[PDB]
Amino acid sequence: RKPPKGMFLSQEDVEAVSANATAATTVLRQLDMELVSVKRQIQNIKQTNSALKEKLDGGIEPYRLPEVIQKCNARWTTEEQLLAVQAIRKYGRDFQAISDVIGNKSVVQVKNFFVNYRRRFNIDEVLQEWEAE
Template structure:
């Protein structure tokens, strides 16, 4: 108990502030205790840690976004079909469709999600967050041919994997070794 009391006394001691002779300029400051100096030091450290955490968070977000975009680049040529020119020379993208317009990023994400979730328009709309299932279904009907080709390709690859998977080989246990039972009594 005495140790705690001594620590309080130590923290309450005034800290000497070095006085600089600034040619007649007098600075008035409230007396500083050791406790206030420790608090300032901890606050500076906390500020450094917070700024480091924010920098790390920004770095992680940019790395995650870069990873997502790298994964979507392989499908970019299929989605860019929307940018082809009509007979009059204007692209579909140039026309204003109100709330039915799709950004390049939304189209990439929707295409990727349709490959992943199949024809589950609710799941795709939930991932997008900016489109309704009806809008996703409309997008699907526009891109149906390309998406269906890739979906069929994935289904065939999955079926081939299932038929070629040897359950006995993969899950079979090695020949059981004889076990010696020892009585410890």
């Protein structure tokens, strides 16, 4: 019904290694070469990737910015409103970014801000100017 376990013999493969006198050794060379090819390809991309790693040596350690740990507040100092309006002009609707730039407001307060000041900080005009970029 099926070959012994670990012997491989498909109708198709038998026909291929029989279709002539040396369709045997031919097929076993296309593979002996297909191998050598793929093997040097591996070394090449091993070499490439090795030099790409040497450029990443040191990581980003001389560029990390110490952890700022500040407490979320509810009052908008005029300073903060101004930070916000600018944060908007430069980040559209990305409430997470804005909240981070301001430092002491949460993503929801930031959302509310959009509604509360919409008239007084022409947030319509501002937001449409973030779009033209």
